[PDB]
Amino acid sequence: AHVVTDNCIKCKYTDCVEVCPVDCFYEGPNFLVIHPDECIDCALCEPECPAQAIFSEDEVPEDMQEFIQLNAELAEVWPNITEKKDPLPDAEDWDGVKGKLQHLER
Ligand code: SF4
Numbered sequence: 352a353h354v355v356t357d358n359c360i361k362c363k364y365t366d367c368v369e370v371c372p373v374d375c376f377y378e379g380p381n382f383l384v385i386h387p388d389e390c391i392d393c394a395l396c397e398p399e400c401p402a403q404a405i406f407s408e409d410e411v412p413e414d415m416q417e418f419i420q421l422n423a424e425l426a427e428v429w430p431n432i433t434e435k436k437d438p439l440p441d442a443e444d445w446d447g448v449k450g451k452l453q454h455l456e457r
């Protein structure tokens with residue numbers, strides 16, 4: 352499965368959902384996650400994310416391993432999102448800021 356990591360938080364561009372063939376993205380207030388059981392690892396979403404926050408599981412950075420389990424957990428409680436929407440206000444300001452997990456909203 353593919354995994355959404357740290358840089359998505361407070362950016363949430365949502366450009367990734369338009370190319371997902373199986374609609375396996377789930378939406379949080381300021382973050383998106385990928386459902387590991389529905390994802391077919393087509394990898395089409397990776398180049399579409401301006402935040403470059405999506406990685407295949409085996410490529411998730413060492414300092415963001417927590418996101419693998421987190422995607423699986425939140426994908427079970429958040430609503431499905433299949434349509435592109437406007438990025439969060441000030442997404443540009445937060446794109447590139449590290450350790451945004453501290454700002455994750457349930
Ligand atoms: S790898 Fe493919 S199936 Fe998985 S979330 Fe990305 S676009 Fe969807």
Ligand code: F3S
Binds near residue numbers: 358401
């Ligand atoms: S910022 Fe997040 S909402 Fe999608 S386009 Fe990137 S994983």
